[PDB]
Amino acid sequence: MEAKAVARTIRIAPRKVRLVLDLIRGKNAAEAIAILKLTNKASSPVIEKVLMSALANAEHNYDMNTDELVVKEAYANEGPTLKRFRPRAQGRASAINKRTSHITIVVSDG
């Protein structure tokens, strides 16, 4: 059985998130909450609420054990942006692109 969970319009770029996930994939589950809260970044406290929703639905909806339960698919994909403007020296102006992401985790047994 393969549970999942998705977080939607989360307000961080994808290129900044994808550095943490490569440290999380193809691993155990309780070998991931640890490595997450020992990584000083701002992505880490939102990939930590998103395992624990895929682990709390393999217990009440689908009835698996948390003892051996690993991570099989985690990925981030782009989203909608938010266009803004910064003024400059002369009367000119310049673009700003505040970006978003969607996050997706999959926990499986064997």
Q: How many residues bind RNA (CB under 7 A)?
A: 28
34 binds another protein (CB under 8 A): yes
| Alpha carbon distance 61, 56 (integer Å) | 8
Total Cβ atoms within 10 A of residue 58: 21
Give the helix/strand (H/E) hosting 6: strand 2-10
Whichever of 4 and 27 has its CB closer to RNA, that residue is 4
Q: Which stretch binds RNA (CB under 7 A): 29-37, 63-71, 75-83, 85-93?
A: 75-83
Among 81, 10, 23, 14, CA closest to 50: 10
Select from 35, 42, 56, 82 the one that contacts another protein (CB under 8 A).
Answer: 35
Residues at the site binding another protein, with contacts judged by CB under 8 A: 19-20, 22-23, 34-35, 38-39, 41
